């Protein structure tokens, strides 16, 4: 298990949820959604990290400070450039790197040296085995900076499948265990057609948790039709409870005994 | 729900298992493997159909007739040409079509009119939505012979992914529900590299069962290292009970409540 | 495990259900109730035996024969005297002994050599440790007839608690494991006040399944208000699904691991 | 729900655990056991209250140290009207001996103590009788300026012939009519007025029945325990059992209790 915010995560722990609205829409929208997700995850005993991407950076980050302060929740956001990292790491608990930047070594190194843990998204162009090199390079930067190495996660978000389609290869979730980092599944982005697919979010979420992951990322919204960003792939907030209850059941079923593939 | 052999199958029923050795190796290998699967499946309440491929056709079919006569088990085998349909159908309980022949309508029609149910394999070159037409055509032929139309299953066995690789798109398992036929997942052939992938058989089996299917196919062998065909991808017989017990748990979890994707 | 009808029962197996209307009311009431229970238990994967007590003996058994004929279900009925055994055993799949006859050794003996398995009810006057002697005697008789000994269940139905009251001692369910026979819990009669307690049927069913049993016996009816016998303690047929769903979850939870009492 | 210590309890909430060594044996025995129980319960999200019985001065001192050092709420039994003031000044929850459930001067005094009270049902009472006991405790509280929602009804067995108790699961449902959280005492419900094998059995049954709380005695080495060793659950098995109980608790509270439709 690696230490993440106030809990332990890993293939050998209960899965954690990263969830929130796609973009920081307003302050009430973010605080209300964060609070509702807290209550949902509290009842299910699912460790929960709130996400939104950044109204302006400053105001987005301020609102993220308020979720942290008001609700006591850890928060995660994406960083897009080396110059954003110092400011973002001073506010949030976990950085996340864009999938397209997974091979930009200066940028990955900079996140690695930030002093915060990093959820490293796997590019749509990588093979699952390539993620070992990504994580290893991040760990060299961390070690160079005097920081611990157990602070990265490998995040699956789909691989290119012809034009304008992604496929979620469940083998990837098993392969990336070789990174010795927690594996996270991004269920919302894995259904997106590049360049609504909501119906497939529960499908891939069930499939992934059953495969065996450390964490799950999902976007949500109270009324997704009225969402400011990527609405058609968000799970409505009033259905998150039922979905998570099913995923907890799958997670317990597959972790209660060793994974058969390990005996192969 | 569809009647298959002496049980009810479908998305709302507990999953059924199709399993056996890849090919008929020997009468004793087959009877022993079949018998030991029967005891594993009886203990878990998993409906079970024995499968092996046809030592020559006459001899392979004789031996399958013995699995039937000695053990009271339903049996399934794949049929390779129109010429063999009549003989094979007089011995087995369920026909299965090779994936490459899924668009050969004369062949599909002949299987459909055979008098036996047919597990129709989705070609590695088809899109999931294409399988509706294949099933609709099979049902035409059934109907024209006076036969019930609910005697077909849609079988996922992987889709081409670059060269020498297949990917198991879990969205396919949901999409093919539109065929109004039971969807069956072939976990063994889904991991094969076309043109040593055993470790992914349980991974995809767990993923597919969590996604929601009517049926599961897997090859097994008492000692896969000595198998006469596809040995590297066979699950060992002495690990089948453990695997099946996990799959039952998953199957129940996802079918206890409606699938969330149906709200979408 | 013990082999029962077409399945395997026991303390380590998923629980089975014995259920039906208290008495055979009519052919249509029996067939419809049997058919509804069949479909509910099929979906939940609960092995199922239909029961009703005998319109006259001849007509009662005829109708139970129709349940087998028309629905292919196994059927259980109670027998009341030695002279009725040959006829009843010629029709039904499982005999049941009335609780008050549990010490009538000639009658218990005749049932035990009938050629059919027997659910032996524990008299309201017996202590749980006394059932071992009953089962041991039944097994003597079976063995002497050249029959298998593993063909009996011990069925808990309450113990006398003062006047006009029965209590369900959950310790009995554990103690009677020493019979080396599957233990069955009669939820419907355990709530009866000798000489409407329906509300306690779910209570005691949940307690018993959580305690750990091989089987459950419950009386049901489409509309208990119009039931010809024991109507006020029957579970309505339209609530059986919901109840059984809860009970399967409890059964799995307690049988996933060893029972802690086996360490002590 | 009712507020109890820093959490909410009730038939509609996750079950809480009351547990500890039968008696206060030692400061280190008490602090170590309370610490391991805290860790086990934290891991499972089981709200936890530490119990041991008390001489009295030294017993309450050691119980104050469990609170100070581990931040846990503590419960103990009080035996007489004249112990109440001191006990309530130290502990978070009082508990009344079963035999005293109809001794109303005593029950009233506990009710006016300022603390919540787990009221044990006498082995001689019928389940319907606890309503009267709770109503009278609530009157005493109200007549003294205190909130009425501070009592729990605790099942610990009913007399069954001579030298035996039986745990009537109907009692746990019936006592919901008190509109107070129902607590099951799994340890004393097996005691013959050497029965540890029935503690898991009754705990599982009671949780599946549906209760607000569970009480169990434990010890690191029951063989070497100073009272009731033969009925203690060994500490190194409490995790396993509680894990089972949590699943049962969740499963029965996930939907409405079917008995509420009949
Ligand atoms: Cl697609
Ligand atoms: Cl690969
Ligand atoms: Cl009563
Ligand atoms: Cl006893």
Numbering used by the authors:
A (entry chain B), B (entry chain D), C (entry chain C): 0 to 53, 67 to 207, 215 to 283
D (entry chain A): 0 to 53, 68 to 206, 215 to 283
Please share text taken word for word from the publication where this structure appeared.
By using an ortholog rescue strategy for insoluble or difficult to crystallize targets, we increased our structural coverage of B. thailandensis essential genes from 31/406 (7.6%) to 49/406 (12.1%). For the seven pairs of ortholog structures (with no bound ligand) solved in this study, the average overall Cα RMSD was 1.5±0.5 Å, indicating a high degree of structural similarity. This structural similarity suggests that the ortholog approach is an efficient method to obtain useable structures from otherwise intractable targets, thereby lowering the barrier to structure-based drug design targeting infectious organisms.
Here we report a functional and structural genomics effort that applied saturation-level transposon mutagenesis and next generation sequencing (Tn-seq) to identify essential genes in B. thailandensis, followed by high-throughput structure determination. We used an “ortholog rescue” approach to maximize structural coverage of these gene families, which are likely to be essential not only in B. thailandensis, but also in related, but more virulent, Burkholderia species, such as B. pseudomallei. Using only seven Burkholderia species to select orthologs of essential genes, we solved structures for 49/406 essential gene families, and for 56 total Burkholderia protein targets (including seven ortholog replicates). Of these 56 targets, 25 satisfied criteria for being a potential antimicrobial drug target.
